[PDB]
Symmetry: C3
Subunit: 445 residues, 3 copies
């Protein structure tokens, strides 16, 4: 069929104490409002209408999304008024679902039930019964029949016992909806969206209701404490989905996914790992404690040792990296390569079974197979930046500075503490050798 | 009005298995007993009387606090006996409140209710009703009127149903208190402080009661498991206060504050951050996972990357530091400065927009603006310690050792692998240049 | 008396999505099934019979344990059938207890109650009453008398109210057990082990029942989410045992023990520490945040600073190591030694009060007392591997490469940036000194 959504996101997030529009605040590293858009997209939402008051410019900025239909608003004067501003935008043949930019966790199932329990020429309304309903809108039924919503405000002591409350999420045909809207008053001073419930039982239509499966689906964010609770809920969910799909998390409450994780079989992730962007892990990969991976491919059987950071990096199968290793964009390890502690790799490839074990920096480097990069080796590659190249079976002594552009051919050997400015030939040894000078019985300060 | 406090802290913390007096054990990095003192100070407590048995010397030692009035005690023989030892110390015109050194979480509100519900010539008594009261002192009321306390010990099956129990915290006028005290017996062998309740209804005075708002306010520490529970409670509280005041914590259950955090607006703190001493963070600062900050000022818009440790360090605005960076006391970054991975800074300043990106140690250094500190640069500054100075626009090649005292003037350039013992002049290049020596077809061992 | 156990571990752990047999999956770093074996050993279990279907070879492989009696099985066709396969293996004079390889948390107390509540010529049966019993085997009693087990399957609406359920764990004499077994049918198609309950009330014997003290004792693992819950339970338990025995954990929910921890008095362990293998900590040791210790001895009063990794390493008293330090097998610190940030130690000893503060790698080294290892010092010890030796009171300048085999005698001093290939004599100074070369007004690229 046909269906569009409207996302309300116009209020003042005063209690966020922020210079950033509330709805742009991230949940698992992405704007609250994008979770809602994402969901709308998953419904088949043909169009998405976003209603905003202040924060306009950097809202549409921080949200590229050229596919969206933006809707300005005088200055927050009515949640119903807001719904009026987008009213002329609803095609009469399409359903119109209403969501809030600060309720990021609303599941598709719960909406794709709402859209099924909508009575022809009527409203599908999402509701939840509360433990303590001590301040929300009551759902007022007569014979279990929805007739209208009561604000906690004007609620008799008898009504205040009504557990079931309004999530503020609901459906209706675009035609019928255009109707019910601009037939409402302002006599708080504002216009309540609540009213279109009674103003629907008015002209004899039936308003049905489904419930969300989790309370968190309809949790609204007014402040950061609330947002952090939703972050935890969201992370527990992701973690449990990975556990059930075969990934071992040594402590799923100390795990964070902010993006996507594609994975193979029998992966172990230890405590306090964070996964950002899109990470692909092969079979039998092990990630130690404290590692941060962002936009990485890690090949079958690789081991990432504790406290290793990787971003836009690639490891083939059987590699080992860490502890205390830092791989930056362009870092590439060929099959069975090893990078050790206090080693940084930038736009560099370390070939098959090559080793860089300690205290080294490698950038803008093409290194071959079976190469030994001694402790303390530095590509001195900054003066743009220049390329260092090393063939197979090369031995690079400790504390060597490779001054690029420089090429060291296969089988070459480089003595410790050597500066290399000129190219090195196959199987040639090079030793930057001076003469250590001796004073006898020297009195140390 | 006038008011003093007494802190009881004399028992044997046997179940702590410690050589340190129980009350000195830290909660959020400060002695249990200091939390209690702190609170007393916040009441306006004119004097604080501290009653102790063993542990005396290093108690008054580990607690400088020359403002305190110490009170010795034979050898724990009566909680009431203890209260006798400080009795001659209470002015008749002042209220005397009683607290315990091992109940660190007692809030001011709860005490500044206790002090309001005190009946003239009578006791204000703190109480709590328990889920399971299966071992404490019962509050025995007649017509809801407090008449005396029953030890779980001698408690009829009927009494054992009394949910409400004694926290052991209470008030009373100093005069009246001196009275009720030394009129009690020793016929456990000890003197119970419990009794002064009935010995107050005795001479026809009214004993009122307020409750603490949280159970944790009256939780006593007898062991470390108990202390750890209170640590978590205390940390959750702090975390929620920062969230509500506008700081984003990516996981408030993996956050620890052991001191004070002054903050501006829109700060993000990722998982597993610890804050010690006094930390000042400006607007829009980001602290990555695993960072430890102790006594630091971080300027607006700075980014601290994961696994970075800072102590007594200062960053101006727009600085970036980490990952894997170590800043020690005296470390200072000017506006937009960058410190990278595996870099340590001690008593050194890195000027405007200067960079130290990798594998470097800088101590006792004054470095100017626009300076590039190549990978592997070391201030060789130990032989006391001597000063290294570098002007603006200097380029320092990788793996340079700067042997202090040495001065490198503006615009100078230093080739890679250079040892610098002598001063360098404006725009002068210096290259510690030897000659790499070549053996052909060398057989590597 | 006499007693043997049987561990059932033959099903398909399909929902583990693993190439590793379910029961081999680790809990606190050791195979689920080893926890069960361990427990059996603690009972005095004279023999342990392990029944398995597929996964056979690498089961008996990954479990050396030459003490075990393995029992093959056609192909999972009956949990009772399985129990038949080991039936001919039970001595008539011994008790036979039945356990499952995927229920790792079953305590000895609960089994050493089961073995006491066994009625002569009868069954001791472990049971638990459930909050929601909505899919398990009901315990069917008549006058509170166990008569037989009902599968949730064939269970009247009336029976489905029976809270109490079958853990599947039970006892019986080996003789009697051999009996009750091979008198059962296959008319699911399989043989139910359930039946021997009614087939015991059949020949007029009494089947008693004890309960486990914790629900987690009888939790079965079918998937990784379940296993992770048990991991957390197991870790909370260990943590609380260490807290009660006197170790301070700054956050027991961010602590992991995968092995054994021997400890002395007044130890503090900060957040996110992992303990693997066997770790011995002396009195008054402090372990900072993020440290990983595996098979280490740490002497009285040592301080391990944050983010330090140690494996098969030894520290005497008063040592300090970290932050950001990496100690590998063979790493040894003598009394009061210090290792700083970005320092790696392999098969090396750093003598009394010696210091290696920054950016160094030391392997295969014997270093004496009072030695100063400057920043950036590297043992260039790889060409097998060769030994570097340094006596007392030696000063090693920064960025020195020690090319082993080399010996530096007592009181010697080594200038910064020195390569050392030859031995150094007592109190001799050595400076690898070249000449820095100067270009005036050099235009930096």
């Amino acid at each position: 069929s046909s269906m569009s959504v409207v996302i309300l996101a116009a209020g003042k997030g005063t209690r966020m104490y922020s210079d950033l529009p509330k709805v742009l605040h991230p949940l698992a590293g992405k704007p609250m409002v994008q979770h809602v858009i994402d969901a709308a997209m998953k419904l088949g939402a043909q169009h998405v209408h976003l209603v905003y008051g202040h924060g306009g410019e950097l809202l549409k900025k921080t949200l590229a999304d050229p596919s969206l239909n933006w809707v300005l608003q005088a200055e927050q004067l009515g949640t119903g008024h807001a719904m009026q501003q987008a009213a002329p935008h609803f095609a009469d043949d399409e359903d119109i679902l209403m969501l809030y930019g600060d309720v990021p966790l609303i599941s598709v199932d719960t909406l794709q039930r709402l859209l099924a329990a909508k009575p022809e020429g009527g409203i599908g309304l999402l509701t939840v019964k509360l433990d303590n309903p001590s301040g929300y809108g009551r759902i007022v039924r007569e014979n279990g029949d929805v007739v209208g919503i009561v604000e906690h405000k004007d609620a008799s002591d008898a009504q205040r016992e009504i557990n079931e409350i309004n999530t503020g999420i609901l459906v209706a045909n675009g035609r019928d909806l255009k109707r019910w809207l601009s037939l409402l008053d302002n006599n708080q001073g504002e216009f309540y969206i609540t009213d279109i419930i009674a103003l629907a039982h008015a002209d004899g239509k039936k308003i049905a209701t489904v419930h969300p499966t989790r309370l968190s689906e309809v949790e609204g964010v007014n402040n950061r404490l609330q947002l952090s609770a939703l972050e935890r809920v969201f992370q527990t969910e992701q973690a449990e989905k990975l556990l059930l799909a075969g990934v071992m998390l040594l402590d799923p409450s100390r795990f964070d996914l902010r993006g996507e994780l594609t994975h193979g079989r029998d992966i172990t992730i230890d405590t306090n790992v964070i996964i950002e962007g899109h990470v692909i892990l092969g079979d039998r990969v092990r990630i130690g404690t404290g590692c941060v991976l962002k936009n990485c491919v890690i090949g079958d059987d690789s081991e990432i040792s504790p406290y290793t950071v990787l971003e836009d990096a690639r490891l083939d199968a059987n590699c080992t990296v860490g502890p205390f290793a830092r791989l930056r964009p362009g870092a590439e390890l060929a099959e069975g390569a090893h990078v050790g502690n206090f080693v940084e790799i930038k736009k560099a490839r370390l070939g098959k079974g090559s080793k860089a074990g300690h205290l080294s920096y490698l950038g803008d480097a093409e290194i071959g197979a079976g190469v030994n990069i001694g402790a303390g080796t530095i590509t001195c590659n900054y003066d743009n930046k220049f390329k260092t190249i090393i063939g197979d079976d090369v031995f690079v002594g400790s504390d060597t500075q490779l001054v690029a552009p420089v090429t060291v051919a296969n089988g070459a050997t480089i003595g410790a503490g050597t500066t290399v400015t000129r190219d090195v030939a196959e199987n040639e040894l090079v030793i930057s050798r001076v003469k250590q000078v001796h004073i006898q019985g020297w009195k140390r300060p």
